[PDB]
Scaffold this active site. Structure first.
Site, PDB file in Angstrom:
ATOM      1  N   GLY A   1      -9.610   2.289  -6.302  1.00 18.72           N
ATOM      2  CA  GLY A   1     -10.627   1.383  -5.807  1.00 18.72           C
ATOM      3  C   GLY A   1     -10.275   0.896  -4.418  1.00 18.72           C
ATOM      4  O   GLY A   1     -10.055   1.712  -3.517  1.00 18.72           O
TER       5      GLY A   1
ATOM      6  N   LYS B   1      -6.181  -6.173  -5.500  1.00 16.46           N
ATOM      7  CA  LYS B   1      -6.591  -4.831  -5.881  1.00 16.46           C
ATOM      8  C   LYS B   1      -7.779  -4.937  -6.830  1.00 16.46           C
ATOM      9  O   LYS B   1      -7.694  -5.614  -7.861  1.00 16.46           O
ATOM     10  CB  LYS B   1      -5.426  -4.093  -6.537  1.00 16.46           C
ATOM     11  CG  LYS B   1      -5.621  -2.597  -6.754  1.00 16.46           C
ATOM     12  CD  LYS B   1      -4.316  -2.047  -7.347  1.00 16.46           C
ATOM     13  CE  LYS B   1      -4.101  -0.589  -7.095  1.00 16.46           C
ATOM     14  NZ  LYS B   1      -2.710  -0.226  -7.520  1.00 16.46           N
TER      15      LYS B   1
ATOM     16  N   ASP C   1       4.107   8.693  -7.394  1.00 17.19           N
ATOM     17  CA  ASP C   1       3.215   8.787  -6.242  1.00 17.19           C
ATOM     18  C   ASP C   1       3.897   8.245  -4.995  1.00 17.19           C
ATOM     19  O   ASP C   1       3.297   7.509  -4.200  1.00 17.19           O
ATOM     20  CB  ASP C   1       1.885   8.074  -6.517  1.00 17.19           C
ATOM     21  CG  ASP C   1       0.761   8.544  -5.590  1.00 17.19           C
ATOM     22  OD1 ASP C   1       0.925   9.574  -4.886  1.00 17.19           O
ATOM     23  OD2 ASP C   1      -0.289   7.872  -5.559  1.00 17.19           O
TER      24      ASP C   1
HETATM   25  N1  LIG Z   1      -2.000  -0.886  -2.663  1.00 14.36           N
HETATM   26  C1  LIG Z   1      -1.301  -2.070  -2.577  1.00 14.36           C
HETATM   27  C2  LIG Z   1      -0.644  -2.529  -3.768  1.00 14.36           C
HETATM   28  C3  LIG Z   1      -0.647  -1.699  -5.077  1.00 14.36           C
HETATM   29  O1  LIG Z   1      -1.589  -0.948  -5.311  1.00 14.36           O
HETATM   30  O2  LIG Z   1       0.417  -1.818  -5.734  1.00 14.36           O
HETATM   31  C4  LIG Z   1       0.067  -3.682  -3.735  1.00 14.36           C
HETATM   32  C5  LIG Z   1       0.139  -4.452  -2.534  1.00 14.36           C
HETATM   33  O3  LIG Z   1       0.843  -5.617  -2.524  1.00 14.36           O
HETATM   34  C6  LIG Z   1      -0.491  -4.043  -1.385  1.00 14.36           C
HETATM   35  C7  LIG Z   1      -1.233  -2.824  -1.402  1.00 14.36           C
HETATM   36  C8  LIG Z   1      -1.898  -2.390  -0.207  1.00 14.36           C
HETATM   37  O4  LIG Z   1      -2.570  -1.339  -0.180  1.00 14.36           O
HETATM   38  C9  LIG Z   1      -1.822  -3.156   1.054  1.00 14.36           C
HETATM   39  C10 LIG Z   1      -2.475  -2.700   2.213  1.00 14.36           C
HETATM   40  C11 LIG Z   1      -2.403  -3.407   3.405  1.00 14.36           C
HETATM   41  C12 LIG Z   1      -1.689  -4.595   3.434  1.00 14.36           C
HETATM   42  C13 LIG Z   1      -1.033  -5.056   2.293  1.00 14.36           C
HETATM   43  C14 LIG Z   1      -1.099  -4.359   1.088  1.00 14.36           C
HETATM   44  C15 LIG Z   1      -0.419  -4.830  -0.151  1.00 14.36           C
HETATM   45  O5  LIG Z   1       0.218  -5.884  -0.115  1.00 14.36           O
END
Ligand SMILES: Nc1c(C(=O)O)cc(O)c2c1C(=O)c1ccccc1C2=O
Ligand SMILES: [Cl-]
Length: 260
Positions: free
Chosen positions: A18, A35, A124
């Site tokens: 997502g 998320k 991944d």
């Molecule tokens: N995909 C995650 C996840 C997760 O899917 O585990 C956890 C995260 O904390 C983050 C992200 C990000 O894409 C992200 C992108 C740009 C700035 C901060 C973040 C971020 O902090």
């Protein structure tokens, strides 16, 4: 868009799951990463949540809370924001220097060692899942396809993750059993190659041909940029197509490129 105490702002990350949005928490006047997942299956999401709740390490993302309402189609995972975002985009014409790649690779080693000790295979690992925090260090993100195991390694048969990073033993078309830790090592090798070359070592727009190169094309280093021989040795060992002889994390930790 309001979600209890969180105000949803602009998108900061995106993937198959997502989107991830910046979120403002009015309770503590602080930014988080939110998320947003749509229920379109759903049980893989709660395995990700179950795994994240067990993880507490400087080089791994930190899940804060989960907002799940049966009436809404969306499910929200609140993470501590890793403010500087992915360490790099692949492909790129401006890859990292060797010293920069070593700095981040050292963080990746520590994070993977912790995960494997906690009996998690990430599945991944790639530069876009390595987020740079406030202090400049990496946190491993996106456990959406990670596996938990009992015993000393995972014995797996399913093919998941990002195709260019998938290990060749995960690409049999006969449901063969393969072990888990070496899958993460392979992806760490593709990641380190990406760090210094700005592109993946095996590439093809045709998924059949990409699988075939991962399984059967010998690794080649580009003439430019010219990287150190010990770095070439380390990448070669991590990208050993045979998982039985591929270098293991306890050895990566000791490798002369890593320790100088
Ligand atoms: N995909 C995650 C996840 C997760 O899917 O585990 C956890 C995260 O904390 C983050 C992200 C990000 O894409 C992200 C992108 C740009 C700035 C901060 C973040 C971020 O902090
Ligand atoms: Cl990537």
């Amino acid at each position: 868009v309001q979600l209890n105490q969180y105000t949803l702002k602009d998108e900061i990350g995106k993937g198959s799951y997502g989107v991830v949005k910046l979120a403002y928490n009015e309770n503590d006047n602080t930014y988080y990463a939110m998320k947003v997942l749509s229920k379109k299956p759903i049980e893989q999401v709660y395995q990700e949540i179950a795994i994240l709740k067990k993880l507490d390490h400087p080089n791994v993302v930190k899940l804060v809370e989960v907002l799940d309402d049966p009436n809404e189609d969306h499910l929200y995972m609140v993470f501590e924001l890793v403010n500087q975002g992915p360490v790099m985009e692949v492909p790129t014409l401006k890859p990292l220097s060797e010293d920069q790649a070593r700095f981040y690779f050292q963080d990746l080693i520590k994070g993977i060692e912790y995960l494997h000790y906690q009996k998690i295979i990430h599945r991944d690992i790639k530069p876009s899942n390595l987020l740079v925090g406030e202090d400049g260090h990496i946190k491993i993100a996106d456990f959406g396809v990670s596996n938990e195991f009992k015993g000393s390694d995972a014995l797996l048969s399913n093919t998941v993750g990002t195709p260019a990073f998938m290990a060749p033993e995960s690409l049999s078309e006969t449901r063969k059993i393969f072990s888990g830790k070496a899958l993460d090592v392979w992806a760490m090798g593709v990641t380190l190659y990406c760090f210094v070359f700005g592109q993946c070592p095996f590439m093809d727009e045709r998924i059949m041909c990409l699988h075939s190169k991962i399984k059967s094309q010998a690794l080649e280093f580009p003439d430019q940029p010219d990287i150190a021989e010990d770095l070439k040795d380390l990448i070669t060992r991590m990208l050993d197509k045979n998982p039985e002889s591929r270098i293991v994390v306890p050895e990566i930790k000791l490798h002369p490129w890593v320790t100088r």
